[PDB]
Scaffold this active site. Structure first.
Site, PDB file in Angstrom:
ATOM      1  N   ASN A  24     -12.140   8.563  -2.658  1.00  0.00           N
ATOM      2  CA  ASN A  24     -11.053   9.455  -2.402  1.00  0.00           C
ATOM      3  C   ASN A  24     -10.656   8.942  -3.653  1.00  0.00           C
ATOM      4  OD1 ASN A  24     -11.235  11.707  -0.668  1.00  0.00           O
ATOM      5  ND2 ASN A  24     -11.810  10.711   0.528  1.00  0.00           N
TER       6      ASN A  24
ATOM      7  N   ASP B 218      -5.195   6.901   6.749  1.00  0.00           N
ATOM      8  CA  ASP B 218      -5.539   5.914   7.232  1.00  0.00           C
ATOM      9  C   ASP B 218      -5.412   4.272   7.126  1.00  0.00           C
ATOM     10  OD1 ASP B 218      -6.094   6.131   4.187  1.00  0.00           O
ATOM     11  OD2 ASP B 218      -8.087   5.065   4.771  1.00  0.00           O
TER      12      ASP B 218
HETATM   13  O1  LIG Z   1     -12.351   5.794  -0.224  1.00  0.00           O
HETATM   14  C1  LIG Z   1     -11.194   5.755   0.652  1.00  0.00           C
HETATM   15  O2  LIG Z   1      -9.915   5.232   0.950  1.00  0.00           O
HETATM   16  C2  LIG Z   1     -11.010   6.469   1.604  1.00  0.00           C
HETATM   17  N1  LIG Z   1     -10.217   6.840   3.085  1.00  0.00           N
HETATM   18  C3  LIG Z   1     -10.511   7.949   3.965  1.00  0.00           C
HETATM   19  C4  LIG Z   1     -11.897   8.307   3.515  1.00  0.00           C
HETATM   20  N2  LIG Z   1     -12.375   7.948   2.216  1.00  0.00           N
HETATM   21  C5  LIG Z   1     -13.200   7.703   1.570  1.00  0.00           C
HETATM   22  C6  LIG Z   1     -13.807   7.018   1.921  1.00  0.00           C
HETATM   23  C7  LIG Z   1     -15.857   7.338   1.032  1.00  0.00           C
HETATM   24  C8  LIG Z   1     -16.898   6.429   1.810  1.00  0.00           C
HETATM   25  C9  LIG Z   1     -16.527   5.639   2.913  1.00  0.00           C
HETATM   26  O3  LIG Z   1     -17.587   4.302   3.487  1.00  0.00           O
HETATM   27  C10 LIG Z   1     -14.628   5.241   3.231  1.00  0.00           C
HETATM   28  C11 LIG Z   1     -13.852   6.067   2.952  1.00  0.00           C
HETATM   29 ZN   LIG Z   2      -5.550   5.373   0.348  1.00  0.00          ZN
HETATM   30 ZN   LIG Z   3      -9.373   4.725   2.846  1.00  0.00          ZN
END
Ligand SMILES: O=C(O)c1nccn1Cc1ccc(O)cc1
Ligand SMILES: [Zn+2]
Ligand SMILES: [Zn+2]
Ligand SMILES: [Zn+2]
Length: 231
Positions: free
Chosen positions: A179, A87
């Site tokens: 994550n 991301d």
């Molecule tokens: O936690 C992160 O940094 C992440 N990057 C990609 C996916 N995630 C989990 C996530 C969980 C909930 C959310 O509203 C948005 C993302």
């Molecule tokens: Zn990340």
């Molecule tokens: Zn993220």
């Protein structure tokens, strides 16, 4: 109103003006059947733009560049990825092919290469030690220490008092960790503390995902991280 994940088809990108010459960009991506929103930042630097983080993939990042030309109309000349996950660096090759000079810390470039993620071309020196800060045009880059990942950077826009915390900071509506496979749980609250101490004047605080707010996102994040630590 700030856009949420159900309002953005995967493949489209929204812009949201935070302050004079400062926007976030919002995109969506599917992962393991679910769909997730994701932020990056756009900072005007004279008559060019500095991009903070991709829009989570080649398709989204091409749409990001097209929305920027549509709504702002200034060239994106440099981009900074705030850590090595998809991301943040997914779409870097699209940025490079568009002539954007792509940047990240050696730490982020090294981790991206091990993970198999796209690798920003240029290295950001002077950020390897917790508490390090360097100027990068219209922003200050700050390494608070390991948190969501060992390499996460935060970005501050002094002219607008906008603190971009990236994924080391959670939106208030997010009450569980998520994550954290690559996180340093033991050091995360200490790193957040460093952000508080270094940018107490921040008026706006932008998480890597979800709704912006103020500095109260920092204590909120500490709470969520400690609760996950005590699982
Ligand atoms: O936690 C992160 O940094 C992440 N990057 C990609 C996916 N995630 C989990 C996530 C969980 C909930 C959310 O509203 C948005 C993302
Ligand atoms: Zn990340
Ligand atoms: Zn993220
Ligand atoms: Zn909270």
């Amino acid at each position: 109103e700030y856009p949420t994940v159900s309002e953005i088809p995967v493949g489209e990108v929204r812009l949201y003006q935070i302050a004079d010459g400062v926007w976030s960009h919002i995109a969506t991506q599917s992962f393991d059947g679910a769909v997730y929103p994701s932020n990056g930042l756009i900072v005007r630097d004279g008559d060019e733009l500095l991009l903070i983080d991709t829009a989570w993939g080649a398709k989204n990042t091409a749409a990001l560049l097209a929305e920027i030309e549509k709504q702002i109309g200034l060239p994106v000349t440099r981009a900074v990825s705030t850590h090595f996950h998809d991301d943040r660096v997914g779409g870097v090759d699209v940025l490079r092919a568009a002539g954007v000079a792509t940047y990240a810390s050696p730490s982020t470039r090294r981790l991206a290469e091990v993970e198999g993620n796209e690798i920003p071309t240029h290295s950001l020196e002077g950020l390897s030690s917790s508490g390090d800060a360097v100027r990068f045009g219209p922003v200050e880059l700050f390494y608070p220490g390991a948190a969501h990942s060992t390499d996460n950077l935060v970005v501050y826009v002094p002219s607008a008092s906008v603190l971009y915390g990236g994924c080391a900071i959670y939106e208030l509506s997010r009450t569980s960790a998520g994550n954290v496979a690559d996180a340093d749980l033991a050091e995360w609250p200490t790193s957040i503390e460093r952000i508080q101490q270094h940018y107490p004047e921040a008026q706006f605080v932008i998480p890597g995902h979800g709704l912006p707010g103020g500095l109260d996102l920092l204590k909120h994040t500490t709470n969520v991280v400690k609760a996950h630590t005590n699982r």
